[PDB]
Design a protein around this ligand. Sequence first.
Ligand SMILES: CN(C)CC(=O)Nc1ccc2c(c1O)C(=O)C1=C(O)[C@]3(O)C(=O)C(C(N)=O)=C(O)[C@@H](N(C)C)[C@@H]3C[C@@H]1C2
Ligand SMILES: CN(C)CC(=O)Nc1ccc2c(c1O)C(=O)C1=C(O)[C@]3(O)C(=O)C(C(N)=O)=C(O)[C@@H](N(C)C)[C@@H]3C[C@@H]1C2
Ligand SMILES: [Mg+2]
Ligand SMILES: [Mg+2]
Lengths: 197, 197
Amino acid sequence: SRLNRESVIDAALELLNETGIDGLTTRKLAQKLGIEQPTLYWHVKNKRALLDALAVEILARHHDYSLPAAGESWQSFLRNNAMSFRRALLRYRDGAKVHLGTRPDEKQYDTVETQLRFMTENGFSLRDGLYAISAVSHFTLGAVLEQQEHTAANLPPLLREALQIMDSDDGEQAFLHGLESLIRGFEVQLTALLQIV
Amino acid sequence: SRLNRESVIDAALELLNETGIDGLTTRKLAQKLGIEQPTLYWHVKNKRALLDALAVEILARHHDYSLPAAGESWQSFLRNNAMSFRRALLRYRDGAKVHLGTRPDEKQYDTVETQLRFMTENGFSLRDGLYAISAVSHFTLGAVLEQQEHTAANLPPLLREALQIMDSDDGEQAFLHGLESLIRGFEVQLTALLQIV
Ligand SMILES: CN(C)CC(=O)Nc1ccc2c(c1O)C(=O)C1=C(O)[C@]3(O)C(=O)C(C(N)=O)=C(O)[C@@H](N(C)C)[C@@H]3C[C@@H]1C2
Ligand SMILES: CN(C)CC(=O)Nc1ccc2c(c1O)C(=O)C1=C(O)[C@]3(O)C(=O)C(C(N)=O)=C(O)[C@@H](N(C)C)[C@@H]3C[C@@H]1C2
Ligand SMILES: [Mg+2]
Ligand SMILES: [Mg+2]
């Protein structure tokens, strides 16, 4: 195929879908593109640079709810942004694993900056707004991971029923439920001000 | 060294600390123990069986707050149990990655069963109690992961300050903060009953 940022990424995405993050090796990428390793090396220097680019690309191509709508509430944003995040993280095999460890990329600077400011101008201190943003991120990541990494791998009464409930759907209900509890818990903090809550 | 469940696990734990979950190969384990691969194979059948055992052992050896104290509140348990969980997950390199994908092991059946019943007899339905337990688990996992996997790998004003705050300590504050918001959010649900909250 052609060898430019976009073509290379597409092949990388398709390859991830087939072999998972572990099967994803520059060697396999070369074959997929129908080229020799030295040709690939000229474009993609290594596995981490390749994965970093993927983490970025996955979000820019599927994470539709990144910036808040006109006059939207901080609660609705956190909910919508979290859902979008989870959605994008699921689009690809090991998607959540690819994202793991990454920090805002330059292209994202704009988007993340805006998220932080939006939270402050709604009553959050940089600290608290950051923490709300973080908790949502950490909660979404772990849920998706435990879901994906689970599928890719004598019981007592309550536990038994628990296990059936956890298979009813692909962890979606439990997530949305936890998401609400998280957002609400943030409310009780914002409105609590300096009072003992 | 000796080759029995405990000696093999110890070597596996020490090895994980040195090479990470990826460097952890049955081949490297054999050398560490000072034995030949076929000797190891007689004991440890494969990487997954080895990792599963580790996930179990890490918790049984460091997760001290697994069952609730006499007459303890569901909020204090969720908080203490979550802290212990995070603590154990940090004790070893890639600890959170080892745990990923695992389900309660037979030895744990007792412990998990008890956690579920304790939540129900405090007003939670199996469903809701499960979800509270899950959200805590998913939140703790993701925080630890993003922390560990981060270390093992032109900025705008707000984002810049945000990044400094996220390095102040090893993600502990942000976690405890999110933990409280999560627990509180669960309260608002329990006491809300059938009323529109
Ligand atoms: C502890 N260590 C990871 C260092 C550290 O905390 N730095 C960080 C400091 C600040 C951030 C960080 C990290 O890692 C992110 O990774 C964010 C996202 O991925 C994003 O989803 C993020 O990048 C985007 C996005 N591009 O749209 C989001 O939608 C945010 N929501 C909450 C899902 C989220 C914003 C985070 C900002
Ligand atoms: C979606 N998929 C993973 C399937 C599924 O959800 N099954 C599951 C169904 C039910 C559970 C599950 C999974 O995976 C656990 O993994 C739990 C723990 O690891 C534990 O930390 C857990 O094993 C222990 C423990 N042994 O002490 C804990 O302390 C619990 N707290 C909340 C940290 C937690 C209980 C979970 C029960
Ligand atoms: Mg991230
Ligand atoms: Mg688990």
